[PDB]
């Protein structure tokens, strides 16, 4: 290649690039209307109606807010959104750290049962020899 003028050309498909995937959402399960009727009353799904419609004469005008309290009300919701996220994030950190601790614990009882059977093993033989004498006197009493 150096002697001639041949130059390396790299395939674009063969090169490695970041994938940059996005997480996947799935539709909710749909229960056929025939199945819902066939289901027993205890297992029947029960839902609430929307009932959005209201008659013109019955409906009332909405509250009109002054700009001052809207500043206060928007501030509280923004503070509530941040606080709710912080507690939920801290919950997972507590959940994760407790998980390895329980996993760390289970290793010792697996080791602990190993010394349990070996120590009991030497004592077990002495008990077994006593049971032999009970065979000869089993018939007599």
């Amino acid at each position: 290649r150096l002697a001639h003028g041949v130059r390396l050309k790299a395939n674009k498909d063969s090169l490695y690039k970041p994938i940059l995937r996005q997480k996947k959402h799935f539709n909710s399960l749909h229960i056929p209307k025939a199945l819902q009727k066939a289901l027993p009353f205890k297992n029947k799904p029960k839902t609430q109606a929307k009932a959005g419609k209201v008659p013109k004469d019955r409906r009332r005008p909405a509250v009109i807010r002054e700009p001052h309290e809207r500043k206060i009300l928007a501030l509280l919701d923004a503070l509530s959104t941040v606080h709710s996220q912080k507690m939920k994030k801290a919950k997972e950190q507590r959940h994760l750290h407790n998980k390895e601790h329980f996993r760390a614990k289970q290793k010792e009882e697996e080791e602990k049962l190993k010394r349990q059977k070996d120590l009991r093993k030497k004592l077990f033989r002495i008990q077994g020899q006593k049971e032999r004498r009970n065979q000869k006197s089993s018939l007599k009493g």
Binding site: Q22, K23, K71, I72, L75, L76, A78, L79, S80, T81, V82, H83, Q85, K86
Partner: protein, 114 residues
């Protein structure tokens, strides 16, 4: 029954007869802000709240000025407000941090939705 009802209107003699104030939308707004004080300052950390609900007996007031703390600890009268929520509305440091955190969550959530 009537003597029970009279005794629940006050905290009791152990705390010199504190009364339970009537709950309003301005009093409830202040108590909700106090519960969520952990997220106001990223560099300040607080202990867990004593109770999940609101206290039954409480009172609202302001700290008296002291002549000795003229420079060390005193807020000018122009900066003082009537309520806790209005104090949060006024200071620039809390507003600047909160809007950045809130926008970040929504920008994250917009990507989450898509």
């Amino acid at each position: 029954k009537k003597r029970r009802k009279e005794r629940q209107k006050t905290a009791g003699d152990g705390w010199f007869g504190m009364k339970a104030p009537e709950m309003t939308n301005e009093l409830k707004n202040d108590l909700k802000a106090l519960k969520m004080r952990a997220s106001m300052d990223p560099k300040r950390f607080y202990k867990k709240n004593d109770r999940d609900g609101f206290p039954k007996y409480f009172q609202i007031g302001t700290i008296v000025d002291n002549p000795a703390d003229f420079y060390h600890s005193r807020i000018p009268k122009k900066q003082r407000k009537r309520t806790i929520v209005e104090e949060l509305l006024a200071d620039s440091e809390f507003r600047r941090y909160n809007r950045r955190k809130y926008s970040e969550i929504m920008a994250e959530k917009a990507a989450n939705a898509a």
